[PDB]
Design an enzyme around this catalytic site. Structure first.
Site, short mmCIF file in Angstrom:
data_model
loop_
_atom_site.label_atom_id
_atom_site.label_comp_id
_atom_site.label_asym_id
_atom_site.label_seq_id
_atom_site.Cartn_x
_atom_site.Cartn_y
_atom_site.Cartn_z
CG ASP A 137 -2.06 1.06 1.09
OD1 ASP A 137 -2.29 1.65 0.00
OD2 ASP A 137 -2.70 1.31 2.14
NE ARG A 141 -3.77 5.56 0.72
CZ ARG A 141 -3.77 5.27 -0.59
NH1 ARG A 141 -3.83 6.23 -1.50
NH2 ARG A 141 -3.75 3.99 -0.99
CG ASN A 142 -0.19 4.69 3.36
OD1 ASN A 142 -0.84 5.28 4.23
ND2 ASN A 142 -0.71 3.75 2.58
CG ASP A 155 -0.95 2.81 6.55
OD1 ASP A 155 -1.07 3.58 7.52
OD2 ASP A 155 -1.90 2.18 6.01
C1 LIG Z 1 -2.28 11.69 4.24
C2 LIG Z 1 -3.45 11.78 5.23
C3 LIG Z 1 -3.03 11.19 6.61
O1 LIG Z 1 -2.49 10.08 6.63
N1 LIG Z 1 -3.29 11.94 7.71
C4 LIG Z 1 -2.93 11.41 8.93
C5 LIG Z 1 -1.70 11.71 9.52
C6 LIG Z 1 -1.32 11.12 10.75
C7 LIG Z 1 -0.11 11.39 11.37
C8 LIG Z 1 0.26 12.68 11.54
N2 LIG Z 1 1.45 12.71 12.21
C9 LIG Z 1 1.80 11.46 12.46
N3 LIG Z 1 2.91 11.01 13.11
C10 LIG Z 1 3.10 9.67 13.28
N4 LIG Z 1 2.18 8.78 12.78
C11 LIG Z 1 1.08 9.24 12.14
N5 LIG Z 1 0.24 8.28 11.63
C12 LIG Z 1 0.39 6.93 11.86
C13 LIG Z 1 0.25 6.00 10.81
C14 LIG Z 1 0.35 4.61 11.03
C15 LIG Z 1 0.57 4.12 12.34
C16 LIG Z 1 0.67 2.72 12.59
N6 LIG Z 1 2.00 2.17 12.26
C17 LIG Z 1 3.03 2.06 13.10
O2 LIG Z 1 2.96 2.39 14.28
C18 LIG Z 1 4.12 1.55 12.47
C19 LIG Z 1 5.37 1.27 12.87
C20 LIG Z 1 6.31 0.75 11.98
C21 LIG Z 1 5.92 0.53 10.66
C22 LIG Z 1 4.62 0.85 10.30
C23 LIG Z 1 3.75 1.34 11.19
C24 LIG Z 1 2.47 1.74 11.08
O3 LIG Z 1 1.82 1.67 10.03
C25 LIG Z 1 0.67 5.04 13.39
C26 LIG Z 1 0.56 6.43 13.17
C27 LIG Z 1 0.85 10.59 11.97
C28 LIG Z 1 -2.30 10.28 11.37
C29 LIG Z 1 -3.56 10.00 10.81
C30 LIG Z 1 -3.86 10.56 9.58
O4 LIG Z 1 -5.09 10.35 8.98
C31 LIG Z 1 -5.39 8.97 8.78
C32 LIG Z 1 -6.65 8.88 7.92
O5 LIG Z 1 -6.42 9.66 6.73
#
Ligand SMILES: *CCC(=O)Nc1cc(-c2c[nH]c3ncnc(Nc4ccc(CN5C(=O)c6ccccc6C5=O)cc4)c23)ccc1OCCO
Length: 267
Positions: A137, A141-142, A155
């Protein structure tokens, strides 16, 4: 090392604000307050939706892999909390996802920034390939933005418009289908966050690809950059570039960015 993954107690992290939400769960900005330490660490906390039915051992097995990734352009899992839900804790990426960053900052993004992001994403994907991990994926966005010139893939561990044709038709996912998604991701960056195949139903995409049509050349892209993108969308998966090649080619382009991208105001 199993030492790479912290099993967090509920008292060790606090959800303070919402970062975003979707069908898969809610991400919060919060604090990691490890017991027996004297620090409060900004983190992101993703709480997955509660499932009606995997076993804790299998989840932890996968979480250990996510905690083991050691590359500056791939997110690493810092901690996990298993309750009625799975909660994943990792470092906060304060500038958010790269898709929304490029949309918000488009009038102020230059060619060297864009090409550096392409290098960094290719480096992170090459690392996942070395770890034998297929992302499935990859999309703008990821990719998360730690600082404007330090990005990381997240992601991992159905996005039809990012998928290779063999994934749509046969559910085959490989490092080479990830390369297809990388080409779409580069297209998103070079269009400052345009939607691929905007307004086209997901079920029509395979027929577009079958006919030989592809995402159009972004105005800022010179022929050498668009040719790389088009190579990522060959029907023959083994004719697509490898991530190690993409690192080399985009690194070369990042050494002479004005040769390869013609952005607003360039002569
Ligand atoms: C593009 C729109 C979007 O995604 N918006 C969005 C942003 C965030 C966001 C903002 N700041 C952030 N800092 C850290 N993390 C996130 N998001 C996030 C994504 C995935 C995960 C889960 N996760 C893990 O913990 C991990 C560890 C190792 C390898 C992979 C992963 C993994 O996938 C945690 C945190 C931040 C958050 C939410 C948002 O909107 C989502 C819906 O559009």
């Amino acid at each position: 090392n199993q030492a790479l993954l912290r099993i967090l107690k509920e008292t060790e992290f606090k959800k303070i604000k919402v970062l975003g939400s979707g069908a898969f769960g809610t991400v919060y900005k919060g604090l990691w307050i490890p017991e027996g330490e004297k620090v409060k660490i900004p983190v992101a906390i993703k709480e997955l939706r509660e499932a009606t039915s995997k076993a804790n051992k299998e989840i932890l097995d996968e979480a250990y892999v996510m905690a083991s990734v050691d590359n500056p352009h791939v997110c690493r899992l810092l901690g996990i909390c298993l309750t009625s839900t799975v909660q994943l804790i990792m470092q906060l990426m304060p500038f958010g996802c790269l898709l929304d960053y490029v949309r918000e900052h488009k009038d102020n993004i230059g060619s060297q920034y864009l090409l550096n992001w392409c290098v960094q994403i290719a480096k992170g994907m090459n690392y996942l390939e070395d770890r034998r991990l297929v992302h499935r994926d990859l999309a703008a966005r990821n990719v998360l933005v730690k600082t404007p010139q330090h990005v990381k893939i997240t992601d991992f561990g159905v996005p039809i418009k990012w998928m290779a044709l063999e994934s749509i038709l046969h559910r085959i996912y490989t490092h080479q289908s990830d390369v297809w998604s990388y080409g779409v991701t580069v297209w998103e960056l070079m269009t400052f966050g345009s939607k691929p195949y905007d307004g086209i139903p997901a079920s029509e995409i395979s027929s577009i690809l079958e006919k030989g049509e592809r995402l159009p050349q972004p105005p800022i892209c010179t022929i050498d950059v668009y040719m790389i993108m088009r190579k990522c969308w060959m029907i023959d998966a083994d004719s697509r570039p490898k991530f190690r090649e993409l690192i080399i080619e985009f690194s070369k382009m990042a050494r002479d960015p004005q040769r390869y991208l013609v952005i607003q105001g360039d002569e």
